[PDB]
Design a protein around this ligand. Structure first.
Ligand SMILES: NCCc1c[nH]c2ccccc12
Length: 144
């Protein structure tokens, strides 16, 4: 199951707001809670109960932007998400990470993984100027 599959599956109050979502803008409520769980699982960033996986993010974050703060932000955000209910957990992880100083680099790792899993860029693809354009054109095909 891919991010595209999760998007295909959006109910219709959320799908008119696709581009907001795909800009990493925060949207609340339990429809969003279950989209973001779907996508975080599709990208292999959270466990089944929806808890952030430290080890899926630590190395990828640090390769792009080497920074001690990724450890700190990961521990904080996992700590938060564990304390909310499972319906809400992956979304809370996602929201926390985006708000932290790791947000910048998280969006890059997230973009890269999305397009790697979509077969659109090679598995060793780095966050290059070319890649930024590939992402923009990919979004444009989606009306974003
Ligand atoms: N290329 C980023 C697309 C994106 C950002 N946040 C999302 C949340 C749900 C699904 C896609 C996204």
């Amino acid at each position: 199951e891919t991010v595209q599959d999760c998007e295909n599956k959006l109910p219709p109050s959320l799908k008119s707001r696709l581009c907001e979502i795909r800009r990493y803008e925060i949207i609340e409520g339990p429809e969003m809670d279950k989209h973001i769980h779907c996508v975080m699982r599709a990208l292999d960033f959270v466990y089944e109960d929806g808890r952030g996986d430290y080890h899926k993010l630590y190395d990828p974050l640090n390769i792009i932007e080497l920074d001690k703060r990724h450890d700190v932000n990961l521990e904080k955000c996992i700590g938060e998400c564990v304390q909310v209910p499972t319906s809400e957990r992956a979304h809370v992880f996602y929201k926390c990470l985006l708000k932290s100083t790791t947000g910048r680099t998280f969006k890059k790792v997230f973009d890269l993984m999305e397009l790697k899993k979509a077969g659109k860029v090679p598995q060793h693809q780095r966050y290059t100027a070319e890649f930024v354009q590939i992402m923009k054109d990919y979004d444009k095909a989606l009306n974003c």
